[PDB]
């Protein structure tokens, strides 16, 4: 029943199957890193991410006079085995908390079924996997074997609080926006969280609030997983498509723009900032993309490799994209089924909806201003649980989101930096 059927310890010996030294397809080179496969298609790498981006391999904090507003540096974070063990257990617990909700189960299921499309070959009559959607796992005999995967959770790069969903691009194909999908690497940490304010007028003001309430890290991870969902099904919205915020004087005076992809991901009222016309434009766009994939699958009859058969992969993508098949054997995209899947990934899986399922206090909108960053430790059950997060039932932290109240549950939060006034 649990999402992660094993209680991994960082020091558990490698077995070359689900505990192994691996290398990622970053085009650059690296020494193997110890990784853990926590569920089918999902791996966790308890290391700071100095791999997906060759230029971002320096964790050292730049000169103090060169740092920005919302940012936090600590070159030493996640450098010891104890931290890595705690990181692994923290991420595992968050997957369990997410999976414990019907919405989370639905999202995680969609992610596991969202295998990146096999479209790296030139012969349209040949299905081949794109190697950047794989990792190289060191087998017991010391040899490398390629394994496809959908998701990897890795530690943050230099700026510890810059969580994000990233993936390797293609020379020509826009994998996250052409329906194909690509392996998603989420830079994330269960060891820190952010403070927000309970009053909307204060939370959306850059000069007020110290961050009384702490964001539940399960929501933060879910937010990234929602992005991963969009990207795995190749329906993410181009980052250049943004909303020139005209509903917040502080954003306005600074010309701040928020991508539609973020508004979509948050959901709730934020999603409404994307008008119908442009919304229909995107939907039709991805519908065509799914159609192209449907035809590529029709022309495709031969396959590369021998790990899986053609009849298997064709069905794999028929299942992923929920396509239809006629008497002959030709696939087509069903109007109704496409809209249902598209809507599930973009409107059902949202941050706002996860807040409803977790019963936690959270920012009411994406268009706000961070107040602070806190150090936390969600591994001990006396601190945080799969079922209640910080708001432990049958304790003084059970009601009124007392567990998330950093003033009441002060022992669970260490403020590392204040952001208010720095904007």
């Amino acid at each position: 029943m649990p999402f992660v059927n094993k209680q991994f310890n960082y020091k558990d010996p490698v077995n070359g199957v689900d505990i192994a030294y691996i290398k990622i397809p970053n085009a650059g080179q690296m020494q193997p890193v110890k990784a853990f496969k926590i569920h089918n298609k999902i791996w966790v790498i308890p290391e700071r991410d100095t791999f997906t981006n060759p230029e971002e391999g320096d964790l050292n904090p730049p000169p103090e006079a060169k740092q920005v507003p919302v940012s936090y540096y600590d070159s030493t974070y996640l450098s010891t085995d104890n931290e890595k063990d705690n990181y692994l257990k923290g991420v595992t617990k968050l997957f369990e908390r997410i999976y414990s909700t019907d919405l989370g189960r639905m999202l995680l299921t969609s992610i596991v079924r969202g295998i990146p499309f096999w479209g790296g070959s030139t012969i349209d009559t040949e299905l081949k996997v794109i190697d950047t959607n794989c990792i190289n796992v060191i087998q017991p005999d010391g040899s490398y074997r390629s394994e496809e995967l959908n998701l990897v959770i890795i530690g943050p790069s230099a700026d510890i609080i810059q969580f994000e969903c990233k993936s390797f691009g293609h020379e020509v194909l826009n994998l996250t926006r052409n329906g194909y999908g690509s392996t998603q690497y989420i830079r994330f940490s269960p060891d820190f969280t952010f403070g927000f304010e309970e009053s909307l007028e204060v939370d959306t003001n850059p000069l007020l609030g110290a961050g009384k309430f702490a964001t539940d890290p399960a929501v933060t991870l879910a937010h990234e997983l929602i992005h991963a969902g969009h990207r795995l099904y190749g329906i993410a919205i181009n980052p250049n498509r943004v909303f020139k915020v005209n509903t917040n004087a502080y954003y306005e005076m600074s010309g701040l723009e928020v991508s539609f992809e973020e508004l979509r991901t948050f959901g709730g009222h934020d999603a409404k900032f994307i008008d119908s016309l442009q919304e229909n434009e995107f939907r039709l766009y991805y519908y065509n993309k799914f159609k192209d994939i449907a035809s590529t699958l029709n022309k495709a009859k031969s396959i590369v490799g021998t790990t899986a058969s053609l009849q298997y992969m064709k069905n794999v993508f028929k299942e992923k994209y929920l396509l239809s098949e006629d008497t002959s054997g030709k696939f087509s995209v069903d109007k109704l089924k496409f809209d249902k899947l598209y809507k599930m990934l973009t409107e059902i899986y949202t941050e706002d909806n996860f807040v409803k399922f977790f019963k936690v206090l959270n920012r009411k909108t994406y268009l706000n201003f961070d107040k602070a960053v806190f150090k936390i430790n969600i591994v001990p059950k006396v601190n945080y649980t799969i079922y209640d997060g910080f708001n432990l039932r049958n304790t003084n932290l059970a009601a009124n989101f007392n567990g998330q109240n950093t003033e009441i549950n002060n022992m669970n939060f260490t403020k590392l930096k204040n952001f208010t006034g720095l904007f």
Binding site: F163, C165, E262, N368
Partner: peptide, 4 residues
Amino acid sequence: RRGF
């Protein structure tokens, strides 16, 4: 991404 968390954003501002």
